[PDB]
Amino acid sequence: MTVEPFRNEPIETFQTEEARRAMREALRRVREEFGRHYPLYIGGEWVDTKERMVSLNPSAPSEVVGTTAKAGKAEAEAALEAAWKAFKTWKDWPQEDRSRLLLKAAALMRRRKRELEATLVYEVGKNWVEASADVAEAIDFIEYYARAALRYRYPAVEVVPYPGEDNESFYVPLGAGVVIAPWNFPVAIFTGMIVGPVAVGNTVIAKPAEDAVVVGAKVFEIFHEAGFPPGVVNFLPGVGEEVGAYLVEHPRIRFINFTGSLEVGLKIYEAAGRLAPGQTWFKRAYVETGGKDAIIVDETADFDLAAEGVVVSAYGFQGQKCSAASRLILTQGAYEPVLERVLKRAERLSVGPAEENPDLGPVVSAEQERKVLSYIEIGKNEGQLVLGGKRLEGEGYFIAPTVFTEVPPKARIAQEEIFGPVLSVIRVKDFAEALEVANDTPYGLTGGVYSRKREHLEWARREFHVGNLYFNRKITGALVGVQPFGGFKLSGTNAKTGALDYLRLFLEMKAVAERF
Amino acid sequence: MTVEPFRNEPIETFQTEEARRAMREALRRVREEFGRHYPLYIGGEWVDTKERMVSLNPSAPSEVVGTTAKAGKAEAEAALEAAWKAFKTWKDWPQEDRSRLLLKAAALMRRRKRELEATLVYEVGKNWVEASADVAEAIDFIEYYARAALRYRYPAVEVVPYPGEDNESFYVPLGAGVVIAPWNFPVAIFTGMIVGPVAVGNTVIAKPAEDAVVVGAKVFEIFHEAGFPPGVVNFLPGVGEEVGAYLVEHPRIRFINFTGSLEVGLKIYEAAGRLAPGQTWFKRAYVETGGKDAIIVDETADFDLAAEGVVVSAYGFQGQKCSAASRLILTQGAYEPVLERVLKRAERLSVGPAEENPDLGPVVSAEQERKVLSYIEIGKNEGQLVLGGKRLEGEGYFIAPTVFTEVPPKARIAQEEIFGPVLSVIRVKDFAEALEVANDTPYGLTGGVYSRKREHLEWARREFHVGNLYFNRKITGALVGVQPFGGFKLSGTNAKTGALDYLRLFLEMKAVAERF
Amino acid sequence: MTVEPFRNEPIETFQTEEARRAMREALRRVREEFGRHYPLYIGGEWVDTKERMVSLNPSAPSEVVGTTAKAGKAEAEAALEAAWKAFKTWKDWPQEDRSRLLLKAAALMRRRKRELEATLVYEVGKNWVEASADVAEAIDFIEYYARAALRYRYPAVEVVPYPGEDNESFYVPLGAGVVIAPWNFPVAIFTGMIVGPVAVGNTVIAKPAEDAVVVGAKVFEIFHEAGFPPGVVNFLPGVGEEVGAYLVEHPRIRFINFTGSLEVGLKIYEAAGRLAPGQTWFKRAYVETGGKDAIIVDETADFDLAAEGVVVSAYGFQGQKCSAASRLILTQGAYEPVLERVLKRAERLSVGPAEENPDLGPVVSAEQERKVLSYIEIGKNEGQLVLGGKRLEGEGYFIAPTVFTEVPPKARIAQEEIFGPVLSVIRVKDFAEALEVANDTPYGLTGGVYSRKREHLEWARREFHVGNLYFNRKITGALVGVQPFGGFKLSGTNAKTGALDYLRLFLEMKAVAERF
Ligand SMILES: N[C@@H](CCC(=O)O)C(=O)O
Ligand SMILES: N[C@@H](CCC(=O)O)C(=O)O
Ligand SMILES: N[C@@H](CCC(=O)O)C(=O)O
């Protein structure tokens, strides 16, 4: 190696005066720039369009936080042509050179941490620590993939030798692909999904989520200053499915990297399986599609520790995480003790404008608000509402931490991803039943168990079927490198982010033999 | 390691009297066994059916090599139930135990080599050496995957540590899947596609190609004797698309491993991308779909060496290989010298009943013969026929080595996979044009270059876009371990067989963290 | 690895106000619990007995610090049955699972550091830093052995392969054994001797030293909360040799791990060599039996540095360490300079109630006091008393730092382990004579040399025959992992604690071959 061993970027807690001062300064600079317009980024240059998109502050929706250009099919085609033109030479860059470019981008992002965090606060309603964790994770993806990519450098394949011949196998990138990013981790996942494929020689066209187009543009300002060659990375904010559908079904799109709802993920995977007219390859599609994550607590657990972890997991970033604890499975002996503690802690959570660093900011949009409130109405017919369950005062999309108890395992609110601050509590007889209920959903992303019994923990290690399992701690916040992130079943294709294996997904192998 | 380092099984040449004596006895016993009936193999037992399938000797179509039971939807469902039941416990076997089971199977197959080779000679028309190479490769897949699987044993993932926590990532098998095997390497590929997934904990339902059901049954006799637990491997010969379609589209089939025509591969990949009613995962589909492989020869090459390699590559097993040289691209200076040599060598090739160990046996079936002859008629109006181009006398499906020259690069015979003894010769101006023509097809499986110019070879290493490239030697016969086999573009998904990476395709990763 | 690399637990120096406050709080909690009764721990549960044992405060012997149950032969037999029953399943736990259990125990012990330290202060008279070092070392043993155990996981043996066979050699634990722990490091050594064997699959019956039964019980509270399966670890405090003799001579005790006096160690080793009626194995007995450790100082040394190290080594924990410097060998040129400095430093050492953090607390018991005073009387007839040599005022067993000079190398006080604050100074002609005198004792545990002459240091590295040798620093305080601890000659069997080799002592090897 030529750089220090990988270490995760520390997550700012803002416990010091300097940290709080720096954040206030960043928040001021960001809001003073709410009037800024961000164009598309195609072929190494910012390209504007006639029509525009408006980004709103979910904590005060009448306030615009910025506007961006709006890509259509014409711009998507232009981006694809630029991406393929760039691929022709970018694929030949020595890996050491590509990795150094990523390291430069990480250094630039680290120097703009507060600015990006403040943008997350105002654009998507993350409180201070959620915002800091998001940006820190983006930096981690860049630092991690830059190093991981070197493990695949020419010629990396272990082969069996043969007399009188040189047999060399090596990896090569696929080509130009499309990245469809989420609004809940618009810096972290947006960055990771792009730089992973790019690190090993691919080129990318990235479509940010509508609710997070401004922060996505700021990430591209970093890519631009870093110096990625024209066409290697492209930015196409857009409205509706136009751009995404056009690229996903395009005969010249080589791969698709997607993180979002199961509904969209299913359509993408189906489309990727089809041979578009003139297509000359089998498309690769990687999808991360959510979950219905549960935390199991049995009677041997430290009930206070469990309650704290459950509240953090269920309500962090208003429960808008694919990893959020949306189900709390309690064995009979743990039911009353844990539920009472969870309710006591949850009722003390503050909800308000994200910039004030409340425990919960607003949900991301009017549409998300409508969806969450709709599920709350559904829940009233399936379980017992014991906490919250309503919209709070203010134009901002503030929803109170919600808890439903005595929820049937097969109830809609115990099966479908609400993606809001709504926790469903399920009572079970014993640990075996807890595991059965935990596994009985179409998903398999995150899960947790609070217990002191070794046999129960190791039992879960073998049978709680989720891609990311945690014992006696929160089930959210997977760290790059430490906890490869990705699930089973309808949670996706198990493309483990923040792991060496992730980069292999964007490479193909060639074997060349020379008989002397 | 607890066994000797992997070494490829020697391919018998039958030059010694001992080898000839052994082969003659094996051929005699297999012939004397003609007419035998082989049932299906489901849940550890041989299960017969009312209806049956007939396997004919392509060298003498009136002769029935044997008959097998015929599986329908009911048998497929029974096999799927057995495979999932078995998966529950097979996935928990220590890897060392599963690997030892594979090694036992390899030892048993090795002891039945001559018998399996003789069965290939009679059932699919392979001459002696082609049959020996097939069986040797099957043994190699078992020996190689047995060892490779241990590289993924619990807990194999390299992760970054975190203070006060144990973070453990490991691989687990996917579940029960279906294997759809080809008739051209009915022992080798049939075995490889089954044992790879099985080695790491998956269970399989295998559908042999209709023309090679008998040898597939013999491979299962070996699996049974080795002791694979009931349900781990299942044998379902069948007629038509019924069985394959039912399993490929089944909501409970976890993965599909396919090797065959592009037409079928495209349908499988599309079906795999769809969520069948009640399906709870994104199906994985691995497909190897053929090629239109070329050998380029420039004016600096050893023309005699090139001509020999071209003839072996084009006519070995009657050109019925996805790796076969079906295109010969000659630069202006190499055209006359190489073509004259290729014609002289090809016109001396013997064609006759496979048991006689001719240079070429018959094509595999009446339908295949019809298709190859149809392509020859098409070729007569596209290029210039200069050798062969007709069916030979006899009941067997004998076709003479055929050569067309001055073939336009975009002609149907220069673009579509004929899978017969038909070589298309294309004349180009220089090496640059040779590479352009070589790359201009929808495929990308194998390719070769005969040249003494270092700059041309290294240029091809970087730009001749095929998964398996060979310099100054034949382009067929990839050896397990030595030459990871798999292509680009419409040649498939690049699932490299005989390589460490192959097994990763049948595993998913779990990350478990415990905060102490 | 799945956890951070091993690091030694920091030893608290109590230089901060918070540290001192935390210690005072811990001391208060511990003394408020002096009335507590601690039962035996057998088969996963606390089991009380009719008779009890009383633990006294050596700094105020009329004060009881706690009482415990008293095990007899019946309880020892019950513990052995529980240990064997547990072994049957504990031996089959994946090593990763056993190691995680140890890591949990370490985390629990770390959270109770101050409590354990305060218990050591009151029960065995350790001052603050000696107490902190003791607990920190116990944590180190758990953390170290948890990691070291993974190095022996299935199948760990490097063997030579053979054609057509799988040859696998692996380690397995021995069974149920007995641990006989010392009173001088009742948390550290008590813990290490137990968790080392347990980590790799053995089960243990532990007999704490009579003077330290309370702190031993607190360590078992940690084992209990950690969740070791019933029978894996058992606690049997007792009076006299009854329990120890019964287990050591038992036909069903598989191994014996002992740390204590040579007198007892010799008896244990002799008994272990005998085949008890019905015994079906050769018992393994590991014994650490003390020393008569010397520090050599020559004329080239930094005399002030040497004096400081000698005083720390001779009087730390009142010289009650098997590693304590009980002999000071000075060459002629170093004699006066070093002796004067040692006397000046030693005369400034404070002696008093351990809780007040004096340089020296009291010796551990009335019996130890009697022994040390007896050796002082013996010393008066062999050497010249120049410092201390008497009991101080108070009911506590306070003995003043003592120094005898002009001591003959073969004098009883220069040969026998006093285990008290008594240093014997021997004058020698040169370095060669210093080494001769250093080696001329029945022991060989620790030793030290203060010198700037490279040739003398390297000479000692090769010829100062002790298991743990230190240059220009104290000879006590061996750190887990850094300095494998164990001696030569009558200091024991050289079972190096805190080293990878330690765990091998509790394993046996099996070699299994399968001919395919
Ligand atoms: N990796 C994030 C979840 C990302 C997502 O919500 O998609 C976590 O572990 O909290
Ligand atoms: N691996 C074989 C080709 C297998 C196939 O035809 O599918 C070869 O290299 O000749
Ligand atoms: N390991 C301790 C000595 C333990 C004992 O006295 O038995 C030290 O080096 O000081």
From TrEMBL, chains A, B, C:
<feature type="binding site">
    <location>
        <position position="261"/>
    </location>
    <ligand>
        <name>NADP(+)</name>
    </ligand>
</feature>
<feature type="binding site">
    <location>
        <position position="210"/>
    </location>
    <ligand>
        <name>NAD(+) 2</name>
    </ligand>
</feature>
<keyword id="KW-0560">Oxidoreductase</keyword>
<dbReference type="GO" id="GO:0004657">
    <property type="term" value="F:proline dehydrogenase activity"/>
</dbReference>
<feature type="binding site">
    <location>
        <position position="323"/>
    </location>
    <ligand>
        <name>L-glutamate</name>
    </ligand>
</feature>
<feature type="binding site">
    <location>
        <position position="261"/>
    </location>
    <ligand>
        <name>NAD(+) 2</name>
    </ligand>
</feature>
<dbReference type="InterPro" id="IPR016162">
    <property type="entry name" value="Ald_DH_N"/>
</dbReference>
<feature type="binding site">
    <location>
        <position position="261"/>
    </location>
    <ligand>
        <name>NAD(+) 1</name>
    </ligand>
</feature>
<dbReference type="GO" id="GO:0010133">
    <property type="term" value="P:L-proline catabolic process to L-glutamate"/>
</dbReference>
<feature type="binding site">
    <location>
        <position position="477"/>
    </location>
    <ligand>
        <name>L-glutamate</name>
    </ligand>
</feature>
<dbReference type="InterPro" id="IPR050485">
    <property type="entry name" value="Proline_metab_enzyme"/>
</dbReference>
<feature type="binding site">
    <location>
        <position position="289"/>
    </location>
    <ligand>
        <name>NAD(+) 2</name>
    </ligand>
</feature>
<keyword id="KW-0520">NAD</keyword>
<feature type="binding site">
    <location>
        <position position="183"/>
    </location>
    <ligand>
        <name>NADP(+)</name>
    </ligand>
</feature>
<dbReference type="InterPro" id="IPR016161">
    <property type="entry name" value="Ald_DH/histidinol_DH"/>
</dbReference>
<dbReference type="InterPro" id="IPR005932">
    <property type="entry name" value="RocA"/>
</dbReference>
<dbReference type="InterPro" id="IPR029510">
    <property type="entry name" value="Ald_DH_CS_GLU"/>
</dbReference>
<dbReference type="InterPro" id="IPR016160">
    <property type="entry name" value="Ald_DH_CS_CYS"/>
</dbReference>
<dbReference type="Pfam" id="PF00171">
    <property type="entry name" value="Aldedh"/>
</dbReference>
<feature type="binding site">
    <location>
        <position position="181"/>
    </location>
    <ligand>
        <name>NADP(+)</name>
    </ligand>
</feature>
<dbReference type="GO" id="GO:0000166">
    <property type="term" value="F:nucleotide binding"/>
</dbReference>
<feature type="binding site">
    <location>
        <position position="289"/>
    </location>
    <ligand>
        <name>NADP(+)</name>
    </ligand>
</feature>
<feature type="domain" description="Aldehyde dehydrogenase">
    <location>
        <begin position="46"/>
        <end position="512"/>
    </location>
</feature>
<feature type="binding site">
    <location>
        <position position="240"/>
    </location>
    <ligand>
        <name>NAD(+) 1</name>
    </ligand>
</feature>
<keyword id="KW-0547">Nucleotide-binding</keyword>
<protein>
    <recommendedName>
        <fullName>L-glutamate gamma-semialdehyde dehydrogenase</fullName>
        <ecNumber>1.2.1.88</ecNumber>
    </recommendedName>
</protein>
<feature type="binding site">
    <location>
        <position position="322"/>
    </location>
    <ligand>
        <name>L-glutamate</name>
    </ligand>
</feature>
<comment type="similarity">
    <text>Belongs to the aldehyde dehydrogenase family. RocA subfamily.</text>
</comment>
<feature type="modified residue" description="Cysteine sulfenic acid (-SOH)">
    <location>
        <position position="322"/>
    </location>
</feature>
<feature type="binding site">
    <location>
        <position position="240"/>
    </location>
    <ligand>
        <name>NADP(+)</name>
    </ligand>
</feature>
<feature type="binding site">
    <location>
        <position position="417"/>
    </location>
    <ligand>
        <name>NADP(+)</name>
    </ligand>
</feature>
<feature type="binding site">
    <location>
        <position position="210"/>
    </location>
    <ligand>
        <name>NADP(+)</name>
    </ligand>
</feature>
<feature type="binding site">
    <location>
        <position position="210"/>
    </location>
    <ligand>
        <name>NAD(+) 1</name>
    </ligand>
</feature>
<feature type="binding site">
    <location>
        <position position="183"/>
    </location>
    <ligand>
        <name>NAD(+) 1</name>
    </ligand>
</feature>
<feature type="active site">
    <location>
        <position position="288"/>
    </location>
</feature>
<feature type="binding site">
    <location>
        <position position="207"/>
    </location>
    <ligand>
        <name>NADP(+)</name>
    </ligand>
</feature>
<comment type="pathway">
    <text>Amino-acid degradation; L-proline degradation into L-glutamate; L-glutamate from L-proline: step 2/2.</text>
</comment>
<feature type="binding site">
    <location>
        <position position="181"/>
    </location>
    <ligand>
        <name>NAD(+) 1</name>
    </ligand>
</feature>
<dbReference type="GO" id="GO:0009898">
    <property type="term" value="C:cytoplasmic side of plasma membrane"/>
</dbReference>
<feature type="binding site">
    <location>
        <position position="207"/>
    </location>
    <ligand>
        <name>NAD(+) 2</name>
    </ligand>
</feature>
<feature type="binding site">
    <location>
        <position position="181"/>
    </location>
    <ligand>
        <name>NAD(+) 2</name>
    </ligand>
</feature>
<feature type="binding site">
    <location>
        <position position="417"/>
    </location>
    <ligand>
        <name>NAD(+) 2</name>
    </ligand>
</feature>
